[model samples]
Target: SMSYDIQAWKKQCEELLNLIFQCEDSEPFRQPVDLLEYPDYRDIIDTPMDFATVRETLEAGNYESPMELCKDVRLIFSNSKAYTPSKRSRIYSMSLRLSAFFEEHISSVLSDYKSALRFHKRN
Candidate 1:
């Protein structure tokens, strides 16, 4: 039931994404930052990540594992912090809080998935 496990994993990822996207702090990261509006963003961050793009990747089946999906989610916040003027910037602090929230929840989700897989070898 490897495919079964994979489908379940994706479901959990969807739940995690939905939770994060609904957060107040996620507004600025729900879509790609407009390059025309923030022309110098690319000059600072080598790569950009957003909630919409991550959802697309998940739906497109682009990620090899949930680990990869988590990486992109983490990058979204990191990129935000990198481009913000300073640590005290509202955007920077929001990103930090969102990052922590994502990490806490994703860590629990991953552990649960792993425990289920490891302990239920009969499945």
Candidate 2:
């Protein structure tokens, strides 16, 4: 029998989200002048899901399944890339890298799940 640790996936999703958040936070430090010049930029600091939602999903076990949890993770990364300012090419480039990282990790886990499913079907 083969099984994926759903809880572990959830934890990884949380960690990835946290890392993404850190990346966004570092942007201001990287270009303080840009923020000062564009005051409107401060409004959209947080990602699609706010801190409360993330904390509740992880701490209270609010998510229904690993897939659902990973969906949120995917959403955050996608939104980050989509909403990034084009003028800040440095930040935009970093977002692209993070998005690739997210895709690679999730795809790898999904491949494992797919292999397990095929094995079970064969047995």
**Index of the highest-lDDT prediction:** 1
> lDDT value for candidate 1?
0.84
How well is each residue in 1-123 modelled by candidate 2, as lDDT tens digits? 226443455566666656655666434222222447767645764445433355467677777655666676555545556567584677677656766766776675556555655766777
Tens digit of per-residue lDDT, candidate 1, span 1-56? 65335457788889888998899999999999998998888889998999999999
* Candidate 2 CA-lDDT value: 0.57
Model 1, runs deviating above 4 Å: 1-6, 115-123
Query: For all candidates, what are the clash counts?
Result: 0, 0
Candidate 2 clashing pairs, residues 3+ apart or interchain? none
> Cα deviation in Å at residue 78, candidate 1?
1.3
